[PDB]
Each structure stands twice: as structure tokens, then as C-alpha cells.
Amino acid sequence: GEWEIIDIGPFTQNLGKFAVDEENKIGQYGRLTFNKVIRPCMKKTIYENEGFREIKGYEYQLYVYASDKLFRADISEDYKTRGRKLLRFNGPVPPP
């Protein structure tokens, strides 16, 4: 990536709420209620594959409690748009 680790705070909490909202609209886990994003959060750079811009955006991988169950989520954010995508959402997973 390479992955590094960010600490938690308003930025991570915002990502976690995004992930829950987006998974709720998919339906496969039913309606989930956001609780908390815990450590470890980590981040990596997404590079473009061509063109004049170097960096496409960033990927974040989160451990998010929702409805008192722990899930892992991957979210991308676009450099140009600061637009977010939920790439992946899985669980329950064991805690870190």
C-alpha cells in the first residue's frame, strides 16, 4: 500500500457512520445502528494507474461496532472529489 495506522477521532467516527449508512442501504445485515469505531484504523494511498495525477485517493480499513456487533469495513475516498465509497463490509469479526 503501504498501510499505516491513524488513530481514532472525529474523522474515524465520520467514516464509520458512513459505512453503516451505506451497508444499511444494501440490506444484507438488516438495519444496523452505529456505535463506535475502535483502534486499529489504518489508511493507504490509492495511486492512479495512468494520467497526469499521481494519487487517486485513500483507502481506510475500519473496525466498527454497529448494533453491538463488530464489523470490518473498507472505504475509499477520492482525492479529486473527496467522495467516499464503501468497498467492503464484513462481520462479525473478532476483535483486534
d(CA 19, CA 33): 11
Burial class (CB in 10 A: 0-12, 13-18, 19+), 30: exposed
Angstrom CA distances, 11 to 6, 50, 92, stand at 10, 29, 23
Domain that holds residue 58: 1-96
Give dist(CA 53, CA 55) in Å, integer: 6
Method for this entry: X-ray
Amino acid at 29: Y
Identify the CATH number of the domain in which residue 6 sits. Answer: 3.10.450.10
3-class DSSP assignment, residue 75: strand
Q: Which three cell numbers stand for residue 48?
A: 492512479
Q: Write down the residue that cell numbers 466498527 correspond to.
A: 64
Report the domain count for the chain: 1
Task: Kindly give, in sequence order, each residue whose CB lies less than 8 Å from that of residue 93, ignoring residues fewer than 6 positions away.
Answer: 63, 70, 71, 72
- To which residue does cell 453503516 refer? 20
